[PDB]
A paper describes a structure:
[FeFe]-hydrogenases represent one of natures’ most effective classes of redox enzymes catalyzing the reversible reduction of protons to dihydrogen (H2) at turnover frequencies of up to 9000 s-11–3. With their low catalytic over-potential, [FeFe]-hydrogenases represent excellent models for a regenerative and likewise economically feasible H2 production. Their active center (“H-cluster”) can be structured into a standard [4Fe-4S]-cluster ([4Fe]H) and a diiron site ([2Fe]H). Theoretical studies suggest that the most probable PT pathway comprises of strictly conserved residues E282, S319, E279, and C299 (from surface to H-cluster, numbering corresponds to CpI), including two protein-bound water molecules (Wat826, Wat1120 4XDC19, chain B) located between E279 and C29915,16,20. In this study, site-directed mutagenesis (SDM) is used to investigate the PT pathway of two [FeFe]-hydrogenases, namely CpI and HydA1, which represent the largest (M3) and smallest (M1) type of monomeric [FeFe]-hydrogenases, respectively.
Corresponding to earlier crystal structure data, for all CpI variants a space group of P1 21 1 was observed with two copies in the asymmetric unit cell (chain A and B). In wild-type enzyme S319CpI acts as H-bond donor to E282CpI and drags its carboxy group further into the PT pathway. In variant S319ACpI, the carboxyl group of E282CpI is slightly shifted outward, probably due to the lack of the hydroxyl group at position 319CpI. In S319ACpI an unprecedented water molecule (Wat735) is located between E282 and A319, and the nearby water molecule Wat873 of wild-type CpI (chain B) is missing here, suggesting a translocation enabled by the unoccupied space of the missing hydroxyl group of position 319 and the slight outward shift of E282. Although the distance to the carboxyl group of E279 amounts to 5.8 Å, the presence of Wat735 may explain the dramatically diminished yet still detectable H2 release activity of variant S319ACpI (6%).
Residue numbers in the entry: 2 to 576
Amino acid sequence: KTIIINGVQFNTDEDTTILKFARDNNIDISALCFLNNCNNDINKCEICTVEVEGTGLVTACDTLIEDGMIINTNSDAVNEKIKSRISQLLDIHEFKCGPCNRRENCEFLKLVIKYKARASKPFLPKDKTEYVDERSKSLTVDRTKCLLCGRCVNACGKNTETYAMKFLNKNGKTIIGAEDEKCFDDTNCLLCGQCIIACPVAALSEKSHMDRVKNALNAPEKHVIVAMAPSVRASIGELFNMGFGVDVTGKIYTALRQLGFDKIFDINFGADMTIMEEATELVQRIENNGPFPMFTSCCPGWVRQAENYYPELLNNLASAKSPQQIFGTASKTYYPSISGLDPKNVFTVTVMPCTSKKFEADRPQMEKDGLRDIDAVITTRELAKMIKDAKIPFAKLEDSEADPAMGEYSGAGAIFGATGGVMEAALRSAKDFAENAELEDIEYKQVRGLNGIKEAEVEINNNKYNVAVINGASNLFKFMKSGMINEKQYHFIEVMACHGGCVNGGGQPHVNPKDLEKVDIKKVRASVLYNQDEHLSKRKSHENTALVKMYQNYFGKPGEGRAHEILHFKYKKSA
Ligand code: 402
Ligand code: SF4
Ligand code: SF4
Ligand code: SF4
Ligand code: SF4
Ligand code: FES
Ligand SMILES: [Mg+2]
Ligand SMILES: [Mg+2]
């Protein structure tokens, strides 16, 4: 093929789109609705308009290059077409970037500025209440920002295959929303927030818990614990311009203290707890020769998927609470016993890469004696906003350490946030537990990485066992519907609803789709976690000294009695 673009001749054998070819050759073509290798098939945004001599104006994102094509990306006709589309989008867009939560990284604003577009009539609703949906415990919608680009719909389809995000005909107008325009929580939605990650503007957001947190912090009698997820320390730096793949663990501990939190712990402590309980259960099942398979239960997106699509597997889930809720449980029981705090005055806050965690924390039965395991959950993005509002110079902060009692963690706990992390961590303990040994080879590289479905054969006490790692909600559907689960007897299966694991969670920093072209965000965020594991002295959950003391002095033997009654949670199907 010979192609001419803006007077420049190219010779190529490639079969690809105008958009992809131009960008591979440093030619600028704007786009909006094209993402995840899909555009909006009905009602295309046409921001990728280019001119093909002989043909006219075409959409570059879904038009293949052809031999003999003469292309102009920046002619008068092209720019006025694009400007006109943006102008029309402004006509249905509350253009008020001041108090907008996407002010600093909005795709639409950048386009508006680039083409100097203006609305034919500014959209200024007086009563936004009919445009906003805040019913969900996890997600919120503000349709005064929505461009109807379909990016959330395609991402839901591609990441989960549930199609819980749909186009709807509402009062004769097109919107996006859940089936029947119900609250997402009341549908098959996983509350995973991949739709939010896909959104170019502030139409989709997390359900805020920031007011819960600020109120607890300012409440005189409240003692506010905070603990961040594995993934946060590998990610939040992005939002302070520190680059990608930067370990900012110590800076976070420092920032949290400056925010006024009363105790700094870590969810990775909770991860080690979950392994204590879950590895014990795995060994138990092995000894009882069943039931198999056991599934992880730490991902609330997967739990909702099981509840909504495979309720028969609910009994197969590990009874151990997630690191979040198991941590919380201990924060209202164990922690008062070593601090003298009144349990009622403890207010437990987590920082998560996840929107689904908010729903998990607000489950009615996730409490004991009237005390919630977890009182608030803020996303990585929310914590970043609190830090900036407080004018804390994050990139300049000196490192501090966590408070040790529920703050220490092993390398096993640290890798939880990557797909295959829970699996690897769990095997390191299950092998030691079952063989009554302290084995030296602890790295299970076979369950790592971005393959959608991963399997391995493991030898535990000189018997062979089959494990699988399901990487993404759509891959759980594939695993089940394809019958792959029946090709052999699986004994232990990890499921994460977000591809890449929690490092790619719905509460994570948005990433410029151009930076995404340059950076493997799932691998670079994960690399921070495996790096920590590499350099930690303790690399098994049961070698966590603060945790061992907690079990020795308070809970007793894991997976049994006191531990079972308090630290476990079983999901049940309808009769
Ligand atoms: N609870 C919990 Fe987890 C832990 O530890 C997080 O905090 Fe995850 C992360 N990062 C999230 O969100 S949940 C799914 N299991 C893997 S990691
Ligand atoms: S979504 Fe973007 S363009 Fe719209 S008000 Fe917010 S920052 Fe401005
Ligand atoms: S939260 Fe997840 S399952 Fe629900 S609509 Fe968004 S992408 Fe789909
Ligand atoms: S919510 Fe966001 S991603 Fe979905 S159609 Fe509206 S602007 Fe596009
Ligand atoms: S994979 Fe992690 S971030 Fe994604 S829904 Fe599950 S727990 Fe949340
Ligand atoms: S980016 Fe090509 S039609 Fe939207
Ligand atoms: Mg298409
Ligand atoms: Mg206070």
